[PDB]
From a paper:
Protein tyrosine phosphatases (PTPs) play a critical role in regulating cellular functions by selectively dephosphorylating their substrates. The ∼280 residue PTP catalytic domain consists of an α/β structure, and biochemical and structural studies have led to a detailed understanding of the catalytic mechanism (Barford et al., 1994; Zhang, 2002). Here we report the crystal structures of 22 PTP domains, including two tandem-domain RPTP structures and a detailed structural comparison of this protein family.
Structural comparisons of all available PTP structures identified four main WPD loop conformations: a closed state, an intermediate state, an open state, and an atypically open state present in STEP, [name], and GLEPP1. The atypically open state is associated in STEP with a stabilizing 310 helix C-terminal to the WPD loop (Eswaran et al., 2006) and in [name] and GLEPP1 an extra turn of helix α3 following the WPD loop. The presence of an atypically open state, catalytically nonactive conformation, in three PTPs from different subgroups suggests that this conformation may have significance for the family as a whole. Structural comparisons identified an atypically open WPD loop conformation in [name], GLEPP1, and STEP (Eswaran et al., 2006), suggesting a regulatory role in diverse family members. This conformation represents an inactive conformation in which the WPD aspartate is moved far out of the active site. In the first category are TCPTP, SHP1, SHP2, BDP1, [name], PEST, PTPBAS, DEP1, MEG2, and GLEPP1, which have a “PTP1B-like” accessible pocket that harbors a basic residue corresponding to Arg24 of PTP1B. The hypothesis that SHP1 and [name] have the potential to interact with phosphoproteins containing adjacent phosphotyrosines is consistent with reports that Zap-70 is a substrate of these PTPs (Pao et al., 2007).
Author numbering: 1 to 77, 79 to 303
Write the structure that this text describes.
């Protein structure tokens, strides 16, 4: 089939059978069942995360990077200095399109910047507040205007500019290491789509649009984090991945949101964590299919 026919079949199916809350809950339960089975089968061990020297580097004891996809550090390497709570996530064309990580701890701030530097990351997407429900969710790894340089071991971080949009801030950060200076763009998203408001997905799509304005391609990983680096991080990953498929005309004939999320959850645990998050991905993906069909319809007018 061609892309138009694949997209139209997804749209026709969505239109002709609306997915109910019970259906979403049943779907998410199968995803959780797969995780139970994989845990019992020892498919994806987390041995490195579990080492005593690495326990204090994990924000949440239940969220440990699978060994096979963990991001290994080597920049200025102590014997466990290789460990960070982060996993590579494959993009549409190959591995390591994304790094999905936790919000750094006071003890992992240096490790965070080592990762960013070592992997030549340009873009950081933060999808949490510093404080949520009154608890601290992420330590300050960024600089703000007027603060000059913050220092994290040998990394000096300053902020040249902030662009304040409706629901997020784009910080232009300058990072210095060993007399080299790099520009990093941090997108700090400080809202989240509301389950009870269909139009509330628009800002998340706008966030990802802007991100892809700054890096269109997959030459270096994009770092995405929230507090745990699962939940909101997975939503963003999944929507972006799908939009890349759409934009490049490579949606597979077997495309499903269920298979997409299945695939993600095998690369970092709980990468999309809740039924509500699963639903947001579905709704966002459907909107993106509609938008790509419009692109096709206008190109076909020639």
């Amino acid at each position: 089939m061609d892309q138009r026919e694949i997209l139209q079949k997804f749209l026709d199916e969505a239109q002709s059978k609306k997915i109910t809350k019970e259906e979403f809950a049943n779907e998410f339960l199968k995803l959780k069942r797969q995780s139970t089975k994989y845990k019992a089968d020892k498919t994806y061990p987390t041995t490195v995360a579990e080492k005593p020297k690495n326990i204090k580097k994990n924000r949440y004891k239940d969220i440990l990077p699978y060994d096979y996809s963990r991001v290994e550090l080597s920049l200025i390497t102590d014997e466990d200095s290789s460990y960070i709570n982060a996993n590579f996530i494959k993009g549409v064309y190959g591995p390591k399109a994304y790094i999905a990580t936790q919000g750094p701890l006071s003890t992992t701030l240096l490790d965070f910047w080592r990762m960013i530097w070592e992997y030549s990351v340009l873009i950081i997407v933060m999808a949490c507040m510093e404080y949520e429900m009154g608890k601290k969710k992420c330590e300050r790894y960024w600089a703000e205007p007027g603060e000059m340089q913050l220092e994290f071991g040998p990394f000096s971080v300053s902020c040249e500019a902030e662009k304040r949009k409706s629901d997020y801030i784009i910080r232009t950060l300058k990072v210095k290491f060993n007399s080299e200076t790099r520009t990093i763009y941090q997108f700090h998203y400080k809202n989240w789509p509301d389950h009870d408001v269909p139009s509330s997905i628009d800002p998340i799509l706008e966030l990802i649009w802007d991100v892809r304005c700054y890096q269109e391609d997959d030459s270096v990983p994009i770092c995405i984090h929230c507090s745990a680096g699962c939940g909101r991080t997975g939503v963003i990953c999944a929507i972006d991945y799908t939009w890349m498929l759409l934009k490049d005309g490579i949606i597979p004939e077997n495309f499903s949101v269920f298979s997409l999320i299945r695939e993600m959850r095998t690369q970092r645990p709980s990468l999309v964590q809740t039924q509500e998050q699963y639903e947001l991905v579905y709704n966002a993906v459907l909107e993106l299919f509609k938008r790509q069909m419009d692109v096709i319809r206008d190109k076909h007018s020639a």
